[PDB]
């Protein structure tokens, strides 16, 4: 610490890391980037890959949402109990990232024409996570092992936004549904999810969800 | 160990991990999956995300190319010297993955109509990697710190395939150009890159590059 997340006024790719920070009782500052600032050019030019989120942890500056998640993951002990679990955590996170990319593509480039097909394909895309849970001794705790990892926050967010996109999409997935309820009930997380800081923000930049 | 990589007969998303294994003096077995076998559907259905590569390390089975890279990276000591460097390694790898996704999209979904635009946009996409090199000991060593990381192998592959797609793309990037040759000259890697095992394989699976 200290922590500062620089991002647009959207939950988007910062939702998961914010939930992680909140649930872990961490304090951070939010720097909201306006269209004027982004269009001005200097901020974007200073970003490694010309994109947000940008994250600051003391004198350390990071870019890439998954890099931020993994960083918080290793420094806060949310990256498995050993090397094997760490690998499983990565496998889950990469899976989440893949689906998040498809979701982002839908929302920003083909919402009207592609939504129906996407929803029809959704069950096939969610099944792997239901499987991950069932393989983890019944899926009664977390996605990997018996301790929370950065992958849980990323998956949780993925599931939450998909329930908004397709209400009831988790009905055919008992474990994932209960998993959502369980994690969302964690005291600190529950408080954050209900805070104006979270509720006020649109899931995506164009208001589509 | 022992290691087994299950994949289609192409370089694709296994090129980087293979270079890593070879350069680190590791032995592994290759399980080739033909197009016909893949189309039969059974292996596909058993894969967590319905995709290859599939990797075996003893009793452990991992999917997702970056999970395999990170696994090899942490178990073989190719993941930075400390937590901060590990974060920088991730930042580089995520950047590589992002461009690899755009490359894959071009190759498989819009090669004929999209190549020219992609090549025009290439310099802007490669610049971030040249800059990282310049900030790390004048770009005279590795992408992060002074020891090789899994990110180096992934970036190296990304650069190699781009020189095939757009010959001369690295001329305007001195550090990246010298970097590719330096890593390619490493004895074990050099031997692997010249082996029939690598040479006889097409870069992609649709005959485009
Ligand atoms: N791989 C990056 C992707 C971030 C991203 O797509 N950022 C976009 C959407 S918020 C952005 O900054 N767009 C502004 C621009 O590219 O000019 C991550 O995971 O953080
Ligand atoms: N995110 C995965 C992507 C792997 C991937 O896209 N595999 C494709 C291309 S080789 C595949 O298995 N395609 C066959 C199919 O989807 O049916 C990774 O990083 O390993």
Contacting residues for A10 by C-beta, under 8 A, at least 6 apart: A201, A202, A203, A204, A205
Q: Compute and round to an integer the Cα radius of gyration of chain A.
A: 17
Contact of B93 with B66, CB cutoff 8 Å = yes
CA gap A13, A43 in Å, rounded: 18
Bridge-based pairing of strands B60-63 and B54-57 is antiparallel
Option in A62, A87, A98 nearest B91 (CB): A62
CA-closest residue to ligand 2 atom 8: B51
**Which residues is A31 bridged to in the sheet?**
A6
CA gap A30, A201 in Å, rounded: 13
| Residue count of chain B | 209
CA gap A80, A89 in Å, rounded: 7
Ligand 2 atom nearest residue A95's Cα:
1
Query: Among candidates B146, B23, B24, B144, which has minimal Cα distance to B95?
Result: B144
Cα→Cα distances A193→A20, A69, A171, Å: 11, 18, 22
Contacting residues for B134 by C-beta, under 8 A, at least 6 apart: B175
SS3 label, residue A15 = helix
Could you please state the CATH topology (level 3) that the domain comprising A79-186 is classified under.
Answer: Glutathione S-transferase Yfyf (Class Pi); Chain A, domain 2 (1.20.1050)
B185, exposed or middle or buried, with CB in 10 Å at 0-12, 13-18, 19+? exposed
Pocket flag, ligand 1, residue A154 (CB < 6 Å): no
In chain B, CATH 3.40.30.10 sits at 2-78+187-208
Technique employed here was X-ray
> How many CB atoms are closer than 10 A to CB B62?
22
In angstroms, what separates the C-alpha of A51 from chain B's closest C-alpha? 11
CA gap B71, A94 in Å, rounded: 13
B94–A131 CB contact, under 8 Å: no
A7 is in an annotated binding site: yes
A131–B63 CB contact, under 8 Å: no
Pocket flag, ligand 2, residue B16 (CB < 6 Å): no
Bridge-based pairing of strands B3-7 and B28-32 is parallel
Gapped junctions in chain A, after residues (C–N > 2.5 Å): none
Query: Among candidates A96, A62, A93, which has minimal Cα distance to A80?
Result: A93
Query: Among candidates A209, A205, A194, which has minimal Cα distance to A19?
Result: A194
Which residues does chain A have within 8 Å of residue B45's beta carbon, measured at their own beta carbons? none
Ligand 1 atom nearest residue A53's Cα:
20
| Residue count of chain A | 209
Contact of A18 with A5, CB cutoff 8 Å = yes
Alpha helices in chain B (DSSP H): 15-23, 35-40, 42-46, 65-75, 83-109, 111-135, 150-165, 174-185, 187-194, 196-199
- Which numbered ligand comes closest to the C-alpha of B68? 2
SS3 label, residue B45 = helix
CA gap B17, B36 in Å, rounded: 25
Sheet holding B54-57, edge to edge: B28-32, B3-7, B54-57, B60-63
In chain B, CATH 1.20.1050.10 sits at 79-186
In B, minimum Cα distance to A61 occurs at: B88
Pocket flag, ligand 2, residue B95 (CB < 6 Å): no
Is the domain spanning A2-78+187-208 CATH 3.40.30.10? The answer is yes
Pocket flag, ligand 2, residue B154 (CB < 6 Å): no
Structure tokens at B141: 């060593």
Q: Compute and round to an integer the Cα radius of gyration of chain B.
A: 17
CA A52 to ligand 1 center in whole angstroms: 5
């Amino acid at each position: 610490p200290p922590y500062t997340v620089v991002y647009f006024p959207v939950r988007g790719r910062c939702a998961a890391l914010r939930m992680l920070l909140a649930d872990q009782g961490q304090s951070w500052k939010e720097e909201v980037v306006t269209v004027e600032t982004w269009q001005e050019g200097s901020l974007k030019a200073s970003c490694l890959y010309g994109q947000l989120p940008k994250f600051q942890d003391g004198d350390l500056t990071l870019y890439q949402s998954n890099t931020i998640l993994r960083h918080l993951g290793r420094t806060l002990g949310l990256y498995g109990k050993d090397q094997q679990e760490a690998a499983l955590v990565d496998m889950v996170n990469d899976g989440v990232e893949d689906l998040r990319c498809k979701y982002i593509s839908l929302i920003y480039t083909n919402y009207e024409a592609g939504k129906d097909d996407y929803v029809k394909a959704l069950p096939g895309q969610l099944k792997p996570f239901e499987t991950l849970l069932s393989q983890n001794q019944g899926g009664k705790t977390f996605i990997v092992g018996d301790q929370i990892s950065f992958a849980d926050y990323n998956l949780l967010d993925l599931l939450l936004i998909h329930e908004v996109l397709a209400p009831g999409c988790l009905d055919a997935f008992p474990l994932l549904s209960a998993y959502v309820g369980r994690l969302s009930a964690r005291p600190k997380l529950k408080a954050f999810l209900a805070s104006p800081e979270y509720v006020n923000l649109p899931i995506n930049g164009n208001g589509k969800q």
